[PDB]
């Protein structure tokens, strides 16, 4: 509910790490509109989540994981497409620790839920 430090707005959009999503990602590829370019983003989140210490992965960390080859714009592009297919629930969250403003939290959606 409440995004704690050291995370700030500079981290960008946020992805909730889930080990279940590691299997879901292979299952998402059965669904219409799930492209190689979306899977790339998904694999990146998953792999970067291996080192997460707070259950989150930020778009800033995703950029750094590609050594800058994926920009904020390219991540955001894949993210908009993945939302349009239904892969992520978008959750607005606050920091609320003496820090105003919001960012977006993204939670993988179970494929069994997607098809309903």
Short mmCIF file of N, CA and C in Angstrom, two decimals:
data_model
loop_
_atom_site.label_atom_id
_atom_site.label_comp_id
_atom_site.label_asym_id
_atom_site.label_seq_id
_atom_site.Cartn_x
_atom_site.Cartn_y
_atom_site.Cartn_z
N UNK A 1 0.84 -1.20 0.00
CA UNK A 1 0.00 0.00 0.00
C UNK A 1 0.87 1.24 0.00
N UNK A 2 2.00 1.16 0.69
CA UNK A 2 2.83 2.32 1.00
C UNK A 2 4.27 2.02 0.60
N UNK A 3 4.77 2.74 -0.40
CA UNK A 3 6.09 2.47 -0.96
C UNK A 3 7.15 3.13 -0.07
N UNK A 4 8.00 2.30 0.53
CA UNK A 4 8.97 2.78 1.50
C UNK A 4 10.30 3.11 0.83
N UNK A 5 11.08 3.94 1.52
CA UNK A 5 12.42 4.30 1.09
C UNK A 5 13.28 3.05 0.96
N UNK A 6 14.34 3.09 0.14
CA UNK A 6 14.89 4.23 -0.61
C UNK A 6 14.16 4.58 -1.92
N UNK A 7 13.09 3.85 -2.26
CA UNK A 7 12.33 4.16 -3.47
C UNK A 7 11.77 5.57 -3.41
N UNK A 8 11.78 6.25 -4.56
CA UNK A 8 11.22 7.59 -4.75
C UNK A 8 10.58 7.66 -6.13
N UNK A 9 10.11 8.86 -6.50
CA UNK A 9 9.51 9.04 -7.82
C UNK A 9 10.50 8.75 -8.93
N UNK A 10 11.78 9.04 -8.69
CA UNK A 10 12.84 8.77 -9.65
C UNK A 10 12.89 7.30 -10.07
N UNK A 11 12.36 6.38 -9.25
CA UNK A 11 12.39 4.98 -9.64
C UNK A 11 11.46 4.72 -10.83
N UNK A 12 10.44 5.55 -11.02
CA UNK A 12 9.48 5.35 -12.08
C UNK A 12 8.39 4.37 -11.68
N UNK A 13 7.78 3.78 -12.69
CA UNK A 13 6.74 2.80 -12.45
C UNK A 13 7.33 1.56 -11.79
N UNK A 14 6.48 0.82 -11.07
CA UNK A 14 6.89 -0.27 -10.19
C UNK A 14 6.18 -1.57 -10.56
N UNK A 15 6.91 -2.68 -10.41
CA UNK A 15 6.40 -4.02 -10.69
C UNK A 15 6.52 -4.88 -9.44
N UNK A 16 5.41 -5.48 -9.03
CA UNK A 16 5.44 -6.38 -7.88
C UNK A 16 6.05 -7.72 -8.30
N UNK A 17 7.12 -8.13 -7.60
CA UNK A 17 7.76 -9.40 -7.88
C UNK A 17 6.85 -10.54 -7.46
N UNK A 18 6.75 -11.57 -8.30
CA UNK A 18 6.05 -12.79 -7.91
C UNK A 18 6.75 -13.98 -8.54
N UNK A 19 7.02 -15.00 -7.72
CA UNK A 19 7.59 -16.22 -8.27
C UNK A 19 6.58 -17.03 -9.08
N UNK A 20 5.29 -16.92 -8.75
CA UNK A 20 4.26 -17.57 -9.56
C UNK A 20 4.26 -17.04 -10.99
N UNK A 21 4.53 -15.74 -11.17
CA UNK A 21 4.54 -15.15 -12.50
C UNK A 21 5.60 -15.77 -13.39
N UNK A 22 6.61 -16.42 -12.81
CA UNK A 22 7.63 -17.06 -13.63
C UNK A 22 7.00 -18.14 -14.51
N UNK A 23 6.03 -18.88 -13.96
CA UNK A 23 5.29 -19.83 -14.79
C UNK A 23 4.25 -19.14 -15.67
N UNK A 24 3.57 -18.11 -15.14
CA UNK A 24 2.53 -17.42 -15.88
C UNK A 24 3.06 -16.87 -17.20
N UNK A 25 4.31 -16.41 -17.20
CA UNK A 25 4.87 -15.72 -18.36
C UNK A 25 4.93 -16.65 -19.56
N UNK A 26 5.33 -17.90 -19.34
CA UNK A 26 5.24 -18.89 -20.41
C UNK A 26 3.80 -19.15 -20.81
N UNK A 27 2.86 -19.07 -19.86
CA UNK A 27 1.46 -19.30 -20.22
C UNK A 27 0.85 -18.11 -20.95
N UNK A 28 1.31 -16.88 -20.67
CA UNK A 28 0.77 -15.71 -21.35
C UNK A 28 0.93 -15.81 -22.86
N UNK A 29 1.95 -16.54 -23.33
CA UNK A 29 2.25 -16.59 -24.75
C UNK A 29 1.20 -17.34 -25.55
N UNK A 30 0.24 -18.01 -24.89
CA UNK A 30 -0.92 -18.60 -25.54
C UNK A 30 -1.99 -17.58 -25.86
N UNK A 31 -1.86 -16.34 -25.40
CA UNK A 31 -2.95 -15.37 -25.50
C UNK A 31 -2.74 -14.37 -26.64
N UNK A 32 -3.84 -13.97 -27.27
CA UNK A 32 -3.76 -13.05 -28.39
C UNK A 32 -3.13 -11.74 -27.96
N UNK A 33 -2.31 -11.18 -28.84
CA UNK A 33 -1.67 -9.91 -28.60
C UNK A 33 -0.46 -9.96 -27.70
N UNK A 34 -0.03 -11.13 -27.25
CA UNK A 34 1.20 -11.24 -26.45
C UNK A 34 2.35 -11.48 -27.42
N UNK A 35 3.13 -10.43 -27.66
CA UNK A 35 4.21 -10.42 -28.63
C UNK A 35 5.55 -10.75 -27.97
N UNK A 36 6.55 -11.01 -28.82
CA UNK A 36 7.91 -11.19 -28.35
C UNK A 36 8.39 -9.97 -27.57
N UNK A 37 8.02 -8.77 -28.03
CA UNK A 37 8.45 -7.54 -27.37
C UNK A 37 7.84 -7.39 -25.98
N UNK A 38 6.61 -7.88 -25.77
CA UNK A 38 6.07 -7.88 -24.41
C UNK A 38 6.77 -8.92 -23.55
N UNK A 39 6.98 -10.13 -24.10
CA UNK A 39 7.66 -11.18 -23.34
C UNK A 39 9.04 -10.70 -22.90
N UNK A 40 9.74 -9.95 -23.75
CA UNK A 40 11.04 -9.40 -23.37
C UNK A 40 10.95 -8.60 -22.07
N UNK A 41 10.03 -7.64 -22.02
CA UNK A 41 9.80 -6.91 -20.78
C UNK A 41 9.50 -7.86 -19.62
N UNK A 42 8.59 -8.83 -19.83
CA UNK A 42 8.21 -9.74 -18.74
C UNK A 42 9.40 -10.53 -18.23
N UNK A 43 10.20 -11.09 -19.14
CA UNK A 43 11.39 -11.83 -18.72
C UNK A 43 12.34 -10.94 -17.92
N UNK A 44 12.45 -9.67 -18.32
CA UNK A 44 13.35 -8.75 -17.63
C UNK A 44 12.91 -8.52 -16.19
N UNK A 45 11.62 -8.18 -16.01
CA UNK A 45 11.06 -8.03 -14.67
C UNK A 45 11.32 -9.28 -13.83
N UNK A 46 10.99 -10.45 -14.37
CA UNK A 46 11.21 -11.70 -13.65
C UNK A 46 12.67 -11.85 -13.24
N UNK A 47 13.59 -11.72 -14.19
CA UNK A 47 15.00 -11.94 -13.88
C UNK A 47 15.53 -10.90 -12.90
N UNK A 48 15.15 -9.63 -13.08
CA UNK A 48 15.58 -8.61 -12.14
C UNK A 48 14.96 -8.82 -10.76
N UNK A 49 13.77 -9.44 -10.69
CA UNK A 49 13.14 -9.71 -9.41
C UNK A 49 13.91 -10.68 -8.54
N UNK A 50 14.74 -11.52 -9.15
CA UNK A 50 15.63 -12.41 -8.41
C UNK A 50 16.45 -11.67 -7.36
N UNK A 51 16.87 -10.44 -7.65
CA UNK A 51 17.69 -9.67 -6.72
C UNK A 51 16.88 -8.66 -5.90
N UNK A 52 15.57 -8.55 -6.12
CA UNK A 52 14.80 -7.57 -5.36
C UNK A 52 14.87 -7.89 -3.87
N UNK A 53 14.95 -6.84 -3.05
CA UNK A 53 14.93 -6.95 -1.60
C UNK A 53 13.69 -6.32 -1.00
N UNK A 54 12.76 -5.83 -1.82
CA UNK A 54 11.55 -5.22 -1.28
C UNK A 54 10.29 -5.67 -1.99
N UNK A 55 10.36 -6.73 -2.79
CA UNK A 55 9.21 -7.21 -3.52
C UNK A 55 8.88 -6.40 -4.75
N UNK A 56 9.73 -5.44 -5.12
CA UNK A 56 9.45 -4.57 -6.25
C UNK A 56 10.64 -4.56 -7.21
N UNK A 57 10.34 -4.19 -8.45
CA UNK A 57 11.30 -3.87 -9.50
C UNK A 57 10.82 -2.58 -10.17
N UNK A 58 11.72 -1.62 -10.36
CA UNK A 58 11.28 -0.36 -10.95
C UNK A 58 11.67 -0.31 -12.42
N UNK A 59 11.01 0.57 -13.18
CA UNK A 59 11.44 0.80 -14.56
C UNK A 59 12.89 1.31 -14.61
N UNK A 60 13.32 2.05 -13.59
CA UNK A 60 14.72 2.49 -13.56
C UNK A 60 15.66 1.30 -13.49
N UNK A 61 15.35 0.32 -12.64
CA UNK A 61 16.16 -0.89 -12.56
C UNK A 61 16.09 -1.69 -13.86
N UNK A 62 14.95 -1.65 -14.54
CA UNK A 62 14.83 -2.35 -15.82
C UNK A 62 15.75 -1.75 -16.87
N UNK A 63 15.79 -0.42 -16.96
CA UNK A 63 16.74 0.25 -17.85
C UNK A 63 18.15 -0.24 -17.56
N UNK A 64 18.56 -0.15 -16.29
CA UNK A 64 19.92 -0.55 -15.92
C UNK A 64 20.19 -2.02 -16.23
N UNK A 65 19.16 -2.88 -16.16
CA UNK A 65 19.36 -4.30 -16.46
C UNK A 65 19.67 -4.54 -17.94
N UNK A 66 19.21 -3.66 -18.84
CA UNK A 66 19.57 -3.75 -20.25
C UNK A 66 20.81 -2.93 -20.60
N UNK A 67 21.53 -2.42 -19.61
CA UNK A 67 22.66 -1.52 -19.85
C UNK A 67 22.25 -0.33 -20.71
N UNK A 68 21.03 0.14 -20.52
CA UNK A 68 20.51 1.27 -21.26
C UNK A 68 20.01 0.98 -22.65
N UNK A 69 19.99 -0.29 -23.08
CA UNK A 69 19.53 -0.59 -24.43
C UNK A 69 18.02 -0.43 -24.57
N UNK A 70 17.27 -0.76 -23.52
CA UNK A 70 15.87 -0.37 -23.42
C UNK A 70 15.80 0.93 -22.63
N UNK A 71 15.14 1.92 -23.19
CA UNK A 71 14.99 3.22 -22.56
C UNK A 71 13.72 3.23 -21.74
N UNK A 72 13.48 4.33 -21.02
CA UNK A 72 12.19 4.51 -20.38
C UNK A 72 11.06 4.44 -21.39
N UNK A 73 11.27 5.03 -22.57
CA UNK A 73 10.23 5.05 -23.58
C UNK A 73 9.91 3.65 -24.08
N UNK A 74 10.94 2.82 -24.30
CA UNK A 74 10.69 1.47 -24.80
C UNK A 74 10.00 0.60 -23.75
N UNK A 75 10.42 0.71 -22.49
CA UNK A 75 9.71 0.02 -21.40
C UNK A 75 8.25 0.45 -21.37
N UNK A 76 8.01 1.77 -21.35
CA UNK A 76 6.64 2.27 -21.30
C UNK A 76 5.82 1.77 -22.47
N UNK A 77 6.43 1.68 -23.67
CA UNK A 77 5.71 1.17 -24.83
C UNK A 77 5.26 -0.27 -24.61
N UNK A 78 6.20 -1.15 -24.25
CA UNK A 78 5.84 -2.54 -23.95
C UNK A 78 4.85 -2.60 -22.79
N UNK A 79 5.00 -1.72 -21.81
CA UNK A 79 4.08 -1.75 -20.67
C UNK A 79 2.67 -1.38 -21.09
N UNK A 80 2.50 -0.35 -21.94
CA UNK A 80 1.16 -0.01 -22.40
C UNK A 80 0.52 -1.17 -23.16
N UNK A 81 1.31 -1.86 -23.99
CA UNK A 81 0.76 -2.98 -24.75
C UNK A 81 0.36 -4.12 -23.83
N UNK A 82 1.19 -4.40 -22.82
CA UNK A 82 0.92 -5.50 -21.90
C UNK A 82 -0.33 -5.23 -21.06
N UNK A 83 -0.53 -3.98 -20.66
CA UNK A 83 -1.77 -3.60 -19.98
C UNK A 83 -2.97 -3.81 -20.90
N UNK A 84 -2.85 -3.40 -22.17
CA UNK A 84 -3.98 -3.53 -23.09
C UNK A 84 -4.40 -4.98 -23.28
N UNK A 85 -3.46 -5.92 -23.15
CA UNK A 85 -3.83 -7.33 -23.26
C UNK A 85 -4.47 -7.84 -21.96
N UNK A 86 -4.14 -7.24 -20.83
CA UNK A 86 -4.67 -7.66 -19.55
C UNK A 86 -3.68 -8.37 -18.65
N UNK A 87 -2.37 -8.21 -18.89
CA UNK A 87 -1.35 -8.93 -18.13
C UNK A 87 -1.13 -8.34 -16.74
N UNK A 88 -1.39 -7.05 -16.57
CA UNK A 88 -1.09 -6.33 -15.34
C UNK A 88 -2.33 -5.62 -14.82
N UNK A 89 -2.55 -5.72 -13.51
CA UNK A 89 -3.43 -4.80 -12.81
C UNK A 89 -2.64 -3.56 -12.41
N UNK A 90 -3.09 -2.40 -12.89
CA UNK A 90 -2.49 -1.12 -12.53
C UNK A 90 -3.05 -0.64 -11.20
N UNK A 91 -2.17 -0.44 -10.23
CA UNK A 91 -2.53 -0.03 -8.87
C UNK A 91 -1.83 1.29 -8.57
N UNK A 92 -2.54 2.41 -8.43
CA UNK A 92 -1.87 3.64 -7.99
C UNK A 92 -1.50 3.51 -6.52
N UNK A 93 -0.27 3.90 -6.19
CA UNK A 93 0.27 3.79 -4.84
C UNK A 93 0.91 5.11 -4.45
N UNK A 94 1.07 5.31 -3.15
CA UNK A 94 1.71 6.50 -2.61
C UNK A 94 2.94 6.11 -1.82
N UNK A 95 3.78 7.10 -1.54
CA UNK A 95 4.93 6.89 -0.66
C UNK A 95 4.58 7.21 0.79
N UNK A 96 3.84 8.31 1.00
CA UNK A 96 3.18 8.63 2.27
C UNK A 96 4.12 8.56 3.47
N UNK A 97 5.41 8.78 3.25
CA UNK A 97 6.39 8.87 4.32
C UNK A 97 7.06 10.24 4.22
N UNK A 98 6.27 11.29 4.42
CA UNK A 98 6.76 12.63 4.20
C UNK A 98 7.06 12.94 2.75
N UNK A 99 6.44 12.21 1.82
CA UNK A 99 6.66 12.41 0.39
C UNK A 99 5.32 12.32 -0.32
N UNK A 100 4.89 13.44 -0.90
CA UNK A 100 3.63 13.48 -1.63
C UNK A 100 3.80 12.83 -3.00
N UNK A 101 2.69 12.75 -3.74
CA UNK A 101 2.71 12.22 -5.09
C UNK A 101 2.48 10.72 -5.15
N UNK A 102 2.19 10.25 -6.36
CA UNK A 102 1.93 8.84 -6.60
C UNK A 102 2.76 8.34 -7.77
N UNK A 103 2.85 7.01 -7.87
CA UNK A 103 3.39 6.31 -9.04
C UNK A 103 2.44 5.15 -9.33
N UNK A 104 2.79 4.30 -10.30
CA UNK A 104 1.96 3.15 -10.68
C UNK A 104 2.60 1.84 -10.24
N UNK A 105 1.82 1.01 -9.55
CA UNK A 105 2.24 -0.35 -9.21
C UNK A 105 1.56 -1.33 -10.16
N UNK A 106 2.32 -2.31 -10.62
CA UNK A 106 1.83 -3.27 -11.61
C UNK A 106 2.00 -4.66 -11.04
N UNK A 107 0.90 -5.41 -11.00
CA UNK A 107 0.85 -6.75 -10.42
C UNK A 107 0.45 -7.73 -11.51
N UNK A 108 1.23 -8.79 -11.67
CA UNK A 108 0.88 -9.81 -12.65
C UNK A 108 -0.48 -10.38 -12.32
N UNK A 109 -1.25 -10.68 -13.36
CA UNK A 109 -2.59 -11.24 -13.23
C UNK A 109 -2.53 -12.71 -13.63
N UNK A 110 -3.12 -13.56 -12.81
CA UNK A 110 -3.12 -14.99 -13.06
C UNK A 110 -3.76 -15.28 -14.42
N UNK A 111 -3.14 -16.09 -15.27
CA UNK A 111 -3.79 -16.43 -16.55
C UNK A 111 -5.17 -17.04 -16.39
N UNK A 112 -5.41 -17.81 -15.32
CA UNK A 112 -6.76 -18.32 -15.08
C UNK A 112 -7.76 -17.19 -14.91
N UNK A 113 -7.33 -16.08 -14.31
CA UNK A 113 -8.17 -14.89 -14.20
C UNK A 113 -8.30 -14.17 -15.54
N UNK A 114 -7.21 -14.09 -16.31
CA UNK A 114 -7.24 -13.40 -17.60
C UNK A 114 -8.36 -13.92 -18.48
N UNK A 115 -8.47 -15.25 -18.57
CA UNK A 115 -9.40 -15.85 -19.52
C UNK A 115 -10.84 -15.71 -19.09
N UNK A 116 -11.10 -15.25 -17.87
CA UNK A 116 -12.46 -15.07 -17.38
C UNK A 116 -13.03 -13.70 -17.76
#
